[PDB]
């Protein structure tokens, strides 16, 4: 198959290729694999496959998050038209295991518009200076779905779906499970450092706030650096795999109300360490 | 002809036209102007013209920046990697510039625009109140002058002191506001006032909060286009409404471009 990048840094797409075939073919898939491994997030047009194919082909990267939500074919989600996916983020990252990654489909869309985003949080990490490396090596920060989906909600309903989910606390400075790599793993969803305040780094009370604070924003900046980032058009039947330990993405809201249509499969991931 | 846009919010490109016919079809170029100025930035695929077709067509829009064919400058291989208004330094920045790529590695070296227009209209109304009147300087010996011996950062100076251009700028040609603060500007000149000032830090680090907030604009992906070079591919652009970046993605190796750089008047 022709592996094709679209920037140095992440994203490539992949041409020749049957997402189907894949399914029943073990050398396609350890191949498709290996690229989004190095790539970050895989492309493809034209995939016209059937929705049990689309489960099937997530399906051998791992168990498929099937919580019932809004969206026939288990582990399948629709997506029909929300101002949130509009921000640097990794997916449920405020859940104590994200996932692993996701296959999206688009179905039907505008000829224009809707583009989505995705950034290399591993050269995010790699590229900070050294005394920033030094300073967050330890940190651990918490990721919070009260704060950005409950916000709007009515109290009672952003509180029980805070005890529903609680703000997670994962490292800051996360390796990858299947490629030791460290990804910078601070997104939209991260409030705040829950283990900053020591004697190294703070003297007196400015240093502990804002000065973690200003830290946190300087981190979930990078991702809005450009070398980082590599930008999707989408098209009938094209698809998105990506890995979503390694990346956050960024749904472009640039769009008058419309009528666009998505399917997803999101993949089970385990305990960020 | 057919114009595609790339996003919602800027950029399109144009299929079926051949910039060197646009030199002697006036009618082609209303339309070309047109759409520049709808679009903010015109991309076009193989573009096999000479470098006197290329700057013929880039003299329809108004004298060419003249710092073996004149108004032309050749591009072979730090600063461009910025969210910038070119020479906004200047006095009179320029109008813009068509960029042609001659030949280029396969992957890597995108350019992105961002319309600061739309950064304009969807400013929160306190923050337009709050900048309507502000005025900030632009300049090159804290960019380009930085890392020079301090000698040379001085004279570079003295060449081209620090420019004060509105903050919010009208544009010449469709009466759009343009925020008009980028990488380039270093301060507000006008802040400290009664209005905006009670006590010290309302004015600093006050006034260099709401800066960075400002030029923090372009970052924002709904109002940005990001283009893929190919050879002989073409980018045309309205400097008084965008910004651009050079993305700096690639290893170490050789790119060639070549730019026709329009003159521009003084932003008010
Ligand atoms: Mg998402
Ligand atoms: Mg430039």
Redesign the pocket.
């Known amino acids: 198959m022709r592996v094709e990048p679209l920037t140095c840094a992440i994203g490539a797409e992949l041409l020749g290729v049957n997402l189907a075939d894949a399914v029943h073919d073990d050398g396609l898939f350890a191949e498709i694999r290996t690229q989004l491994l190095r790539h970050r997030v895989l492309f493809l047009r034209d995939q016209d496959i059937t929705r049990a194919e689309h489960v099937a082909f997530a399906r051998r990267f791992g168990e498929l998050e099937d919580h019932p939500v809004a969206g026939e074919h288990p582990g399948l989600v629709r997506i029909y038209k929300d101002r949130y996916?509009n921000a640097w983020?990794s997916?449920a990252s405020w859940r104590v295991a994200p996932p692993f990654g996701c296959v999206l489909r688009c179905i039907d869309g505008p000829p224009v518009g809707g583009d989505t985003m995705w950034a290399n949080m591993v050269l995010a990490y790699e590229n900070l200076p050294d005394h920033v490396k030094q300073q967050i090596a330890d940190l651990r920060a918490r990721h919070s779905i009260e704060a950005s989906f409950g916000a709007a909600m009515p109290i009672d309903k952003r509180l029980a779906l805070k005890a529903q989910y609680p703000d997670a606390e994962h490292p800051v400075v996360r390796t990858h499970p299947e490629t030791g790599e460290k990804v910078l793993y601070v997104n939209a969803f991260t409030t705040h450092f829950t283990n900053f305040h020591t004697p190294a780094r703070v003297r007196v009370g400015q240093d502990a706030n804002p000065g973690a604070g200003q830290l946190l924003h300087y981190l979930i900046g990078q991702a809005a650096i450009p070398e980082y980032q590599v930008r999707w058009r989408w098209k009938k039947n094209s698809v998105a795999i990506w890995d979503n330990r390694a990346t956050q993405?960024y749904?472009v809201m640039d769009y008058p109300p419309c009528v666009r249509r998505m399917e997803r499969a999101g993949i089970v991931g385990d305990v960020p360490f």
Do not use: L, Q, S, V
């Open positions: 996916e983020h997916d993405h749904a």
